[PDB]
């Protein structure tokens, strides 16, 4: 029992379930008519136009049933397919694409027992990854929105809650008009891409994309 | 022309072309009968049992033709499919899987001109990503080989050659004996997974795996 999963009940209004309330949703994407994923701009860090790609659920299962558990190869594969799709939006913006599947902020370690715990009271462990663009940090690749982040060549720090020492970067909160501009362009570039021959030839029918209408 | 690609000829004996020489090759995997990828243990950093998954070439193109250029969605998608497969090796070993597609060590920036340069003299830009495992750093998840890396919850630093400030984490070179054990186990776990029922269900005929034997 070296790796353990937290057993815990999260409120329906917890941000992990009510994921659109932050107002940053780009789309929902369904893989092989079964696995459902959300693509949102990161609500707490605008650097590199960061997105989070998150596995919601399979079929009609609850979002909760996909917390704090091992993920199947199909679930992982679907996340990675949605990631492959989203890389093309960064490419069409003229950016170098980077991405990471981490989960550090919902993982912990007890040195006394040697146990690695997956999930916390504040944050469920969800199958998800981060994606962002690199380029000139001062260039507005989307009009009115500087890319931000460190210059190419340097490590982009995604910011772990748990640190052993201070770092030389921090998250940058979204300006409201900039968030709206970035969101609109991500939606448009994705919608355009889904209409391309490249999309059809590579994904065929296996990915269905529904752009989120602002509420 | 804000993103530029290096025009440069690499030696045929350069480590990027002669990839097996470091002696860390796990397998070559072909996606959809066309796109060829290598999976190796990272020759310079054993922490987390890091692997590198690298795009070699398509059909009969040279390895060099896949340096210092944009990658197509098919090339990216194939990399991510091979990644999805390799996640199952880490899962089988009882590890938390993490992975990153970065490229920082082959990307540079000139602030005076605003130009991002892809590829360098010392290192071509290749389509590739890093994967590793998290857990108790002192536990030998593979007998004879402690996992190493920082405790779960902390950020794993993959090391960028270029840094604005000194960091505390550093790469740990492979011990000869440990490398043999880790490699053997990665090959074994991959072999056990490949063509098992779960692999056939998910990947069907999509992925062809050739496990490498030392000669
Ligand atoms: Cl300046």
UniProtKB/TrEMBL annotation, chains A, B:
Residues 24-185 form the LPG0439 HIT-related domain. Keywords: Membrane, Transmembrane, Transmembrane helix. This is LPG0439 HIT-related domain-containing protein. It comes from Legionella pneumophila subsp. pneumophila (strain Philadelphia 1 / ATCC 33152 / DSM 7513). The lineage of its organism: Bacteria, Pseudomonadati, Pseudomonadota, Gammaproteobacteria, Legionellales. The chain holds residues 94 to 308 of 349 of the full protein.
